[PDB]
Write a protein that binds this DNA or RNA. Structure first.
Lengths: 50, 94, 91, 77, 112, 246
RNA sequence: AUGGUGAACUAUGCCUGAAUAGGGUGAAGCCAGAGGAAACUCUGGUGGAGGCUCGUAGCGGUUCUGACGUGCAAAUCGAUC
RNA sequence: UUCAAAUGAGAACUUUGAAGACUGAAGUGGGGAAAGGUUCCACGUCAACAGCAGUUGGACGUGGGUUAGUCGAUCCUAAGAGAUGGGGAAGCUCCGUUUCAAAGGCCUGAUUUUAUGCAGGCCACCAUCGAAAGGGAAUCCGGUUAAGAUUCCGGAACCUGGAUAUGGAUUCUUCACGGUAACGUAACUGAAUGUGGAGACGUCGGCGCGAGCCCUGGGAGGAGUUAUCUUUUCUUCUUAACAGCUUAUCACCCCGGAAUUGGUUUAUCCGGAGAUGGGGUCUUAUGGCUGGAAGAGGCCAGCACCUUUGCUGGCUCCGGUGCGCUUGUGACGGCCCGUGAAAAUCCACAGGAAGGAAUAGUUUUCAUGCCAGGUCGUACUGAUAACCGCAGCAGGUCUCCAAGGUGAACAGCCUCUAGUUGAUAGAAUAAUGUAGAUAAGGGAAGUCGGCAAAAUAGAUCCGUAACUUCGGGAUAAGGAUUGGCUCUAAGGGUCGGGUACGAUCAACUUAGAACUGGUACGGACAAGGGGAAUCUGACUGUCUAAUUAAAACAUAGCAUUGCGAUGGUCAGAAAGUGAUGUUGACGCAAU
């Protein structure tokens, strides 16, 4: 909120680092069920609620 | 600059050019203040200059807080007439 | 130039509130805004700051007193009654 | 951010052992009304402050510059 | 026709947040935050501001020489020197008449 | 039904007192040796305005007996006191306005205020502005005193109970019409949340016993038994008579 | 019926902050003159009060029974007030 | 909105230029608070999203970006929350916040076996939490990035905690001198203890003084216009924190002693309780000169040239004005049955514990010098697409700065600085619509009803009724003028007179007179319709958010009622329990 507490800022940074798609080499692996990143979050879609 | 140079000679001033009331334009207090600070401060130079004595000063000072004084010239004709009242009455008693 | 006739100080209230109430206040607000002699410094500086408190601007004495006036009615007969009972025992 | 007036007092701070450096600024101004002259300033650097002397008469300003201590390393202009 | 902002994150016009408008050397108007003014110290007796003391904020007196904070009378930085003139009069003439009272209590023994 | 408005003041949430600007609790001095065996003198430093009250306060500054210091206390200022006045307190004090004496020490017909119910409660009776009690008689054995409470009731108290001479300042206060709903708003912001008062007539059968009906009217007697029970009591409570006096 | 959750909306009190062009009317208080025995009254000033008034921002939400009414909007838009 | 160009496979929509417009500084600008959380920035890419398109994107994939002793938090307390000791409760837990408490660690003397025993004295406030808008130790200018700066760079300061060294000062009168005094100063001893000031405070009204802005004349430069006129129109001439020196209202001291009462403010308050007068002290918001600091910044010209680019000179000056606007401040005044926070923190004074001059002893409240200054926040929007409303929603949302003209005006209209030009478009001009206008004659004959529209409107002069609680009603009702040009008149200042006049400078105000024209003139804008009665509530105020704003609720005023504390009214499951109550009948409670 432009001037922050560290426990909030530490939770913004965890959500910044989950913000990327799958790495491609994961699909290539034997018995892979996973297709795409289903938990992708977006600041225009779902607000993370702190 | 030409519109304001026209006003300085009085143009565009007439009644159709006036919208706010005569107070809104120039409040009447500011005019009294100017009248009196000018009168009240002209007496203080005469008292200091000895051409009026603090007995007549103290009289005129309180007339100016009422009026009996139209402007700086009426007061100067007033002193000269009032001061001349001190000469005659003294001279007649002498 | 007396301006108003009856209402005086209560002209501030305008036409509202009814004539008696406006006239009954004019009784007191001429007392609380009035200027009184000072029983100490010998001048009249005394004015009211608040209900109960009366402040000299000369000798800086503050003086307790009546709400709307310096000396309450029933007070000036207490300090005589107290002056009398004091002499009773000492005389 | 201070100023010195007497020449002598200025000669002290130059030796005061906190002063590593100084400088000489030359400013061309004019005095009274008509005619110019050459004005110089000497700025000695303390630890906590900066002292300056103003010489408006150039007959003095030259005798002063030579008088600076040799250890003090001066940056002219 | 220039306009200027606060230099701090307080958007609001409160008592500490005052602004003064300054022309910098670089030609621009810029706002300058100003600290609240200092009140003169008061006589603990008559209340009138007691002259000779420098008017600062409270913790800015810790940085100042003692001549700013004092005068050289008794009760120097405290009472207004006409409140010291009285309490000398009152200390002398109360303990003056108070001696005259203690001789009368020796006389009232021998008089009765 | 609902819980009515006077039942709602007991839990004391928004109904508490507005205490911020009040100078303190105005009391008399603790009863000690120096005061009950003799007198002790203070001086009144400044007589000042207290918020929420109607009468001014005085601050008199005593000297602590057993330790070096000053102690200053809050007296409701009697009328006629002035800053710079010596205020004497104790059994052997003198009868003058502002001096606090025991009641046994003053003749009958003496006008005192801020008198105590029991000795050492630091004041109870006649603390409002303009009030006083009169001393109408004594009972020197099994010591008591007969005084007239400001309402006109006659109470009998101990003779060691102190009281301060004179009338309380701030007399004449209610003589002045209040004149508008604003001035009554500025009165009760410094006191408590009592105001304004909705007539129980004008509300619903839930809000009050007087509520309901296709006309505004009470419907049953407006005098209620003293032996009524919580929330039944609204209106004139256990009145012996009613109606305009003659 | 039992056991739990909510005053970010809204209701009301407190604490501590902030916000409000320009005009009209011209109360006490005060100053000079005029009258008269008086108590006082009459004229010219001065001052700048009020839960005064016209009216912007602000807060509302009277009329059109306007627009809209599968709307921009699950309460909004315009004029008026 | 339009033309062209560039990109591209593809352009009403991307980018640059050229035009045309708009928001108009109460902005469609320049910044923050809550909230979001990476939306900021760069490069690539165009499946989906952007209710048309898309080469653009707040999208997509990959990266980079937030720097502090001084700015905030952190600390203090407010309104309140909440342990402990205790007290209830089968119990979850409740009361209460210094309370029925053995509630604690200090200042150094005594020690020169060794450090701290034993020593006298003290001080009784006895958790903690609670504000990024209140209180508060200290930082400014210039430059810098694709994106960060009161943080980075360069320079100039300052505060705090700690260590000690040097110079001065003081000391033989051991702990300074001067002035009648206000008080002065580079310094110039001070424990327990106590007291005083600061922190520290409402609002309105005019008055004064400042700062930035506005206007503006001489001069030095750059740009735009020139068919003709125009000593012309626009633009740059700037000065930070900090430091030293001098300055003023109010306050004060000395001298003298007032009737022939004087001084005096816009506002009538002041004087034998000592006024005017003559001479001094003081604070230093504020202003003034000097240092910062011209070496910076700006504006011009002159030379070199893929680069990198510099280099090189010059000028950066002297003034005027105000009922101007914005904010700060000071002295006064008004208002109240309203008198408008607390604390940490810092200082002074009273006192005199002690400790120390002479062969020499101190003082870090005088100077200078020396060392350290941690932790988390810092990007960007703050909204007609970054917040909330299912969304890229015409809604909702606290705050600062604020240019010229017109005008009473922060209204309306128009412009300069900055910012956009986004909302699907093209061609046609049927009906019915929606929003905006106009009508011959008549003038509510329409309708439940003048609903809706029109009429009125600004200012100046003339004039105003019944009634009235004498305050009002009153802009009552009603009438007359208003443009342009050219003149006349009145209103102020600074200034020299041996112990009447002259000159110069500078204002927006009012009144009057001639002339003038398609009788037009508050020329657009902006801007009351008025009168004779009745019912009803006195008034201001409040309420069904989203069908009711009322004659309903409220109010002042009036009256009644309980209550003297071992109490009135109420709460709790209980209580060593609680609200009124920091109360006391001129009060509290119930009507």
């Amino acid at each position: 909120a432009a001037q922050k507490s560290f426990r909030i800022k530490q939770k913004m940074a965890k959500a910044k680092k989950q913000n990327r798609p799958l790495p491609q080499w994961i699909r290539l692996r034997t018995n892979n069920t996973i297709r795409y990143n289903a938990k992708r979050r977006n600041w225009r879609r779902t607000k993370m609620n702190i | 600059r030409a519109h304001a140079q026209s006003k300085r000679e009085g143009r565009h001033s007439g009644y159709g050019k006036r919208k706010g009331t005569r107070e809104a334009r120039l409040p009447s207090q500011v005019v009294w203040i100017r009248r009196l600070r000018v009168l009240r401060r002209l007496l203080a130079k005469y008292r200091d200059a000895g051409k009026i004595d603090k007995h007549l000063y103290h009289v005129l000072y309180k007339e100016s807080k009422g009026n009996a004084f139209k402007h700086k010239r009426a007061l100067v004709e007033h002193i000269i007439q009032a001061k001349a009242d001190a000469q005659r009455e003294k001279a007649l008693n002498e | 130039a007396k301006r108003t006739k009856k209402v005086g100080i209560t002209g501030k209230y305008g036409v509202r509130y009814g004539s008696s109430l406006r006239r009954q206040v004019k009784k007191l607000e001429i007392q609380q805004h009035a200027r009184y002699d000072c029983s100490f410094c010998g001048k009249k500086t005394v004015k009211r700051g608040a209900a109960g408190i009366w402040t000299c601007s000369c000798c800086k004495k503050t003086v307790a007193g009546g709400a709307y006036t310096v000396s309450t009615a029933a007070a000036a007969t207490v300090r005589s009654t107290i002056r009398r009972l004091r002499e009773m025992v000492e005389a | 951010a201070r100023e010195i007036t007497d020449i002598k007092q200025f000669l002290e701070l130059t030796r005061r052992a906190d002063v590593k450096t100084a400088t000489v600024k030359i400013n061309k101004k004019l005095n009274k009304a008509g005619k110019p002259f050459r004005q110089t300033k000497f700025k000695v650097r303390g630890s906590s402050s900066l002292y300056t002397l103003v010489i408006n008469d150039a007959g003095k300003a030259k005798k002063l510059i030579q008088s600076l201590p040799p250890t003090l390393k001066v940056n002219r202009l | 026709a220039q306009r200027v902002t606060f230099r701090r994150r307080n958007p609001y016009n409160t008592r500490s947040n005052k602004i003064k408008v300054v022309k910098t050397p670089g030609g621009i108007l810029r706002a300058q935050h100003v600290k609240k003014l200092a009140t003169r110290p008061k006589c603990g007796d008559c209340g009138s501001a007691l002259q000779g003391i420098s008017t600062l904020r409270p913790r800015q007196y810790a940085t100042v020489s003692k001549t700013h904070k004092t005068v050289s009378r008794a009760y120097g930085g405290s009472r207004c020197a006409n409140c010291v003139k009285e309490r000398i009069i009152r200390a002398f003439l109360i303990e003056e008449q108070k001696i005259v009272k203690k001789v009368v209590k020796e006389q009232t023994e021998a008089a009765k | 039904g609902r819980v009515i408005r006077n039942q709602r003041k007991g839990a004391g949430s928004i109904f508490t007192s507005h205490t911020r600007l009040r100078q303190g609790a105005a009391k008399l001095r603790t009863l000690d040796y120096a005061e009950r065996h003799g007198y002790i003198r203070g001086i009144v430093k400044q007589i000042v305005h207290d918020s929420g009250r109607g009468a001014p306060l005085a601050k008199v500054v005593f000297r602590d007996p057993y330790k070096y210091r000053l102690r200053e206390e809050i007296f409701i200022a009697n009328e006629g006191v002035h800053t710079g006045q010596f205020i004497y307190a104790g059994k052997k004090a003198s009868l003058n306005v502002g001096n606090v004496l025991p009641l046994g020490s003053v003749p009958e017909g003496t006008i005192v205020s801020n008198v105590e119910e029991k000795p050492g409660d630091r004041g109870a009776l006649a603390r409002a502005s303009g009030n006083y009690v009169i001393i109408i008689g004594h009972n020197p054995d099994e010591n008591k005193t007969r005084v007239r409470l400001p309402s006109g009731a006659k109470k009998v108290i101990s003779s060691d109970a102190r009281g301060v001479i004179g009338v309380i300042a701030g007399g004449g206060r209610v003589d002045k019409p209040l004149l508008k709903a604003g001035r009554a708003f500025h009165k009760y912001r410094l006191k408590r949340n009592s105001w304004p008062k909705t007539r129980g007539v004008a509300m619903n059968p839930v809000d009050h016993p007087h509520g309901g009906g296709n006309h505004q009217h009470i419907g049953k007697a407006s005098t209620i038994s003293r032996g009524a029970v919580s929330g039944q009591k609204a209106g004139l409570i256990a009145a012996r008579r009613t109606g305009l006096l003659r």
